[PDB]
Structures are given as structure tokens and as C-alpha cells.
Ligand binder design. Structure first.
Ligand SMILES: *[C@@H]1O[C@H](CO)[C@@H](O[C@@H]2O[C@H](CO)[C@@H](O)[C@H](O)[C@H]2NC(C)=O)[C@H](O)[C@H]1NC(C)=O
Ligand SMILES: *[C@@H]1O[C@H](CO)[C@@H](O[C@@H]2O[C@H](CO)[C@@H](O)[C@H](O)[C@H]2NC(C)=O)[C@H](O)[C@H]1NC(C)=O
Ligand SMILES: *[C@@H]1O[C@H](CO)[C@@H](O)[C@H](O)[C@H]1NC(C)=O
Length: 519
């Protein structure tokens, strides 16, 4: 049972009154409501979730839900809250006051009795360490704190030290140089996230931001660090990578970055790291574009096992200088070409490599890249423009390759002459395959084969008599000629193996499910 009333985006001005008393979830987000009374919601006795975000409430009396004993989730984010009255009320598990106009931290003493409070979203322009005290005894899981645009004057450096939270997401002011002296190293924080870091100036390259990051080295509890919406020079960017490299963090994630200047930094110290994974999503450079020097050398020689770089104008990734510990590399959505990692015998531990959506073109070159990757189990080169030239001869795939994703390219039926021998998973959909040659019978171990969205009209008589290992197969979005007898072996054989087909391959023009032909 769950009576959901979704009145969001209805231009409401007050809380709808003619609501069923069965309402357990009330969504009135994105409207024009300006007041929240007790009578607005007291009659909804079973109300459990209340979402009034993106309205324009300025005053919050927290006793207005005193009669909603089942309420555990309240979202009042993106309102105009400037005032909050503290009174006895119900124990919430989730309270969101983020993105409001409070001048002081909207923390009520009554918040202390919320023994199940697991998420607290706050808004403020002034943070005093002592104002957090009522909740300093609660084991909160995540706190979102949005510092208003005018935050900055009369800063308390220990303002956060009383927060007892496992995850902290600090949202710094937007459109402002980073000059804030707030210690983000908190005793109990394991997952720290910081949004909006901007330091594009000569005076001193992100010294303030780097300073608070350096205090993240002195806490073994910090395990996950995330940085969002960063704008600074290329030097300061590499300084951040280097600084956090020596912290305690295991997982470091960076998304939405705008970098400028000429990169000078290339003397990276990889020692003393605890990093398990690093991901960099969405990097934008200045008018000159992605650096032509140093950056790849920094990226290629990282002494880590998980490494993602997506959403960048990156064009190379070189063989690591020494034997590399790279284990799972995701370089999807860049501008890399086929020579990436060429002539490389230092990636013998790599097990998965994703090069989806780049600028790969010739498959023989890509298979040569794979030869010395003796542990490589999965390879994704989908959404490129890869063709295979049968003239180049045999392909030197590594024997360890089990899964191969080549969807969204311009391969032909010759592709089946350029497949690793132990192939088990094979995704070729959105290609230019017009037929299935006799080479397929040699893939006994094949378990999955996706040739959807090609130009298949039929398959040979008996092409599956020796593919005893198959479990899943896609055939849809292909123009099959369904006149008997060209469609009979495909009809009888398909009918028997009912569970194996994924989706519904349909006849060209007739539209009938192919299983339904009686030749
Ligand atoms: C390293 O990256 C790999 C993938 O590149 C991560 O593996 C997957 O994790 C998800 C978690 O939801 C699982 O569902 C998948 O089955 C995993 N795939 C494989 C092949 O293991 C892995 O977790 C990452 N490791 C670290 C330490 O971050
Ligand atoms: C290979 O990579 C492609 C992405 O390039 C995967 O494709 C998506 O697959 C799901 C169904 O499995 C669809 O909902 C999406 O529409 C596909 N995306 C595109 C752009 O076509 C594909 O699943 C991958 N194959 C394997 C075996 O992992
Ligand atoms: C409530 O509605 C808003 C706007 O349609 C939507 O973004 C949000 O995800 C919804 N949440 C729930 C729990 O219905």
C-alpha cells in the first residue's frame, strides 16, 4: 500500500486541501506555495513523505507536522526560508532545508531528539561551530550544507568540527574565488564532497583551497573524496591530484572541471598513496584545448588499479614507463585514436578496458594493442568508426579476451575472421553485417552474441549445430526475408530454444514473430 499524490508543477499557491486521507506520499514540488500551516497537512494521518521543494516558503514552524506521526521524510529545499521556529515535533529520518536564505544555521534543539535523522540539508551564510551542538551527539549519515553566496565574512575555522556525520557535502558559493578558511577535515567524515572550487588567479594558485585539502591528510577516517564544478589553472589542477595523492583517500572522484593556462607541472610523485580508484569526468580546457605535453605522462604512469577519464579532449594515452598496476581502465568518451597504448608490454595485469566513443578506426591496430595485455578479459570499443580490413590478415588478439563489445561501428561480415578464439560475449549491434559466414562454427565457447540493428536477411542452414554454449542472442531490428524455405531452419530451430532469444526479431514487411512460421 502506498497512496501517492503527485501535484508537482501545478502552479499551486497553497497546499491542496481536497487530498485523500490515504495519502502516504505527497509531492507538491515546483509550485508557488508561500506558507505551510498545521491545518494544511494535519488531516493526512498516514503521510510519510512530504516534498514541497522548489516553492517559496519563507517561514518554517517545525510543529506544523506535529500531528503527522508517520512523517519521516521532509524536503523543503529550494524555497525562500529565512526564519525557522523551534518547537517539539515528529522524529524525521530525512530533513532537507538546503538552498534556502537562512542567515544562521537552521538547527533547532528539538533536532536532537531525532534519533533516526539520517540526512540533514542545511542553508546558511554564517557558520558558528557552536550552533551545530544540538546534533553533535547524533550519528547522522549525510549532511548537505549550502553556503550562501554572501558567505565569507567572519569565518569560523572549526565551524564543522562538531558535525558527527559519515558523509559531508559542502556546497561552496558560486561565481566566487575560493578564499574560505573552514576546516573540512571532520573527525567522523569518511566520504567528503566539495562543490564549486574556483581559483583562476596569479596572486596565489589556489593556496587557500590547497590548504584545507592538506588537512585531509591527518585523518585516517577519510576514505572517499569527491570534487565537483572546479575552475582553475592546469597547474593548480595537477597540484590537487598530487596533494590528494598522499592523503588517506581510497576513492577520489572529480567531475565538471574547467581548466586554463599552459601546463608546466611534470614531476609527479606517485609514492605514498592509498588510492584504489580515480575517475575524472567532464574536463573542459581553454581556447588552446587539451595540453599537448606532460598530462598523458602523468596519467599513464599512475600507480593505481582503477582509473577513469571521460568527457575530455584527450587524444593519447601512452605505455606506462614501468610495469603498470592498471586493472580497470575506462577511457570512454574522449578523442583517443588507435595508437593508444601501442607497443606496450607493461599492461599485463589489465583485465578490462573501455574505449567506447573515441576515434578508433582500424581493428587490426586495436587487436595489436591487445596482444601483450595478457590478462585482458573485457574490451569495449563501441561507438567509434572501426572497420576491419580482411587484407591485413589474422588479428593478434590476446588469448585471454572473453568479452568484446564492438557495437556502433562500420564492421562487415569479415569481422568474424578477426575475433579472439575464446570469445564468450560478442556485441556487434549497429554495424553493417549482411551475412553470417562459416567461420562462426569455430566459436564453440560463445555464450552471448548481439547482432541486432544490422542488415541480416537470413542465416545458413545449420550454422548453430556446433555452438552448444550459447545462452543469449539478439536478432531484432534486422530485415529478415521470411519466404519459405529461406526462413524454415530459422523457424523450427528458434521455436525449440524458446528462452535463448532476447527481444523479438520480426519479419521484413510481414512483421510476424519469426517463431510463428510453418514451412
Ligand atoms: C574498478 O572498476 C570496476 C569496473 O571497471 C568495478 O567493477 C564492477 O563493480 C560493479 C559495482 O556495482 C559490479 O556490479 C560489477 O560486477 C563490477 N565488475 C567487475 C568486472 O568486477 C570495480 O568495483 C572497481 N573497483 C574499485 C575498487 O573501485
Ligand atoms: C556495448 O556497449 C553499448 C554502448 O555503446 C551497450 O549498449 C546499450 O545497450 C542497452 C541494451 O543492452 C540499450 O538499452 C542501449 O540503447 C544501448 N546503447 C546504445 C547507444 O546502443 C551494450 O549493451 C554493450 N554490450 C555489452 C555486452 O555490454
Ligand atoms: C516529486 O516531483 C518532482 C517534480 O516532478 C520530482 O523531481 C521528484 O523526483 C518527485 N519525487 C517523488 C518522490 O515523487
Amino acid at each position: 500500500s502506498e497512496f501517492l499524490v503527485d501535484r508537482s508543477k501545478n502552479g499551486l499557491i497553497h497546499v491542496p486541501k481536497d487530498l485523500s486521507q490515504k495519502t502516504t506520499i505527497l509531492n507538491i514540488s515546483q509550485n508557488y506555495i508561500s506558507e505551510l500551516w498545521t491545518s494544511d497537512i494535519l488531516s493526512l494521518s498516514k503521510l510519510r513523505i512530504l516534498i514541497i521543494s522548489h516553492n517559496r516558503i519563507q517561514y518554517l514552524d517545525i510543529s506544523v507536522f506535529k500531528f503527522n506521526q508517520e512523517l519521516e521524510y521532509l524536503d523543503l529545499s529550494h524555497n525562500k526560508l529565512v526564519k525557522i521556529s523551534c518547537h517539539p515535533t515528529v522524529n524525521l529520518k530525512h530533513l532537507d532545508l538546503s538552498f534556502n536564505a537562512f542567515d544562521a544555521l537552521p538547527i533547532c534543539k528539538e533536532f536532537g531528539n531525532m534519533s533516526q535523522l539520517k540526512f540533514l540539508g542545511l542553508s546558511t551564510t554564517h557558520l558558528e561551530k557552536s550552533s551545530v551542538l544540538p546534533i553533535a551527539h547524533l550519528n547522522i549519515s549525510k549532511v548537505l550544507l549550502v553556503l550562501g553566496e554572501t558567505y565569507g565574512e567572519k569565518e569560523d575555522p572549526e565551524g564543522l568540527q562538531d558535525f558527527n556525520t559519515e558523509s559531508l557535502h559542502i556546497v561552496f558559493p558560486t561565481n566566487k574565488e575560493f578564499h574560505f578558511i573552514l576546516d573540512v577535515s571532520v573527525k567522523t567524515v569518511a566520504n567528503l564532497e566539495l562543490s564549486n572550487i574556483k581559483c583562476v588567479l596569479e596572486d596565489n594558485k589556489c593556496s587557500y583551497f590547497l590548504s584545507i585539502l592538506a588537512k585531509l591528510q591527518t585523518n585516517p577516517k577519510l576514505s572517499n573524496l569527491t570534487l565537483n564544478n572546479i575552475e582553475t589553472t592546469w597547474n593548480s589542477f595537477i597540484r590537487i591530484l598530487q596533494l590528494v595523492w598522499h592523503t588517506t583517500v581510497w576513492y577520489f572522484s572529480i567531475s565538471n572541471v574547467k581548466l586554463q593556462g599552459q601546463l608546466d607541472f611534470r614531476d609527479f610523485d606517485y609514492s605514498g598513496t592509498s588510492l584504489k580508484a580515480l575517475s575524472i569526468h567532464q574536463v573542459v580546457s581553454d581556447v588552446f584545448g587539451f595540453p599537448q605535453s606532460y598530462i598523458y605522462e602523468i596519467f599513464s604512469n599512475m600507480n593505481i588499479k582503477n582509473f577513469t577519464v571521460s568527457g575530455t579532449r584527450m587524444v593519447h594515452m601512452l605505455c606506462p614507463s614501468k610495469i603498470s598496476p592498471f586493472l580497470h581502465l575506462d577511457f570512454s568518451n574522449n578523442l583517443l585514436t588507435d595508437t593508444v597504448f601501442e607497443n606496450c608490454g607493461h599492461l599485463t595485469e589489465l583485465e578490462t578496458l573501455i574505449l567506447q566513443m573515441n576515434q578508433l578506426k582500424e581493428l587490426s591496430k586495436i587487436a595489436e594493442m591487445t596482444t601483450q595485455m595478457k590478462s585482458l578479459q573485457q574490451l569495449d570499443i563501441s561507438q567509434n568508426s572501426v572497420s576491419y580490413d580482411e587484407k591485413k590478415g589474422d588479428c593478434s588478439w590476446t588469448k585471454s579476451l572473453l568479452s568484446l563489445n564492438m557495437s556502433s561501428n562500420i564492421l562487415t561480415d569479415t569481422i568474424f575472421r578477426c575475433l579472439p578464439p575464446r570469445i564468450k560475449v560478442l556485441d556487434l549491434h549497429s554495424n553493417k553485417i549482411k551475412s553470417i559466414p562459416k567461420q562462426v562454427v569455430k566459436l564453440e565457447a560463445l555464450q552471448e552474441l548481439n547482432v541486432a540493428s544490422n542488415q541480416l536477411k537470413s542465416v545458413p542452414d545449420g550454422i548453430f549445430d556446433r555452438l552448444t554454449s550459447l545462452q543469449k542472442i539478439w536478432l531484432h531490428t534486422n530485415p529478415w526475408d521470411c519466404s519459405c524455405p529461406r526462413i524454415d531452419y530459422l523457424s523450427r530451430w528458434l521455436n525449440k530454444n524458446s528462452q535463448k532469444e532476447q527481444g523479438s526479431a520480426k519479419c521484413s514487411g510481414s512483421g510476424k514473430p519469426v517463431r510463428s512460421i510453418i514451412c
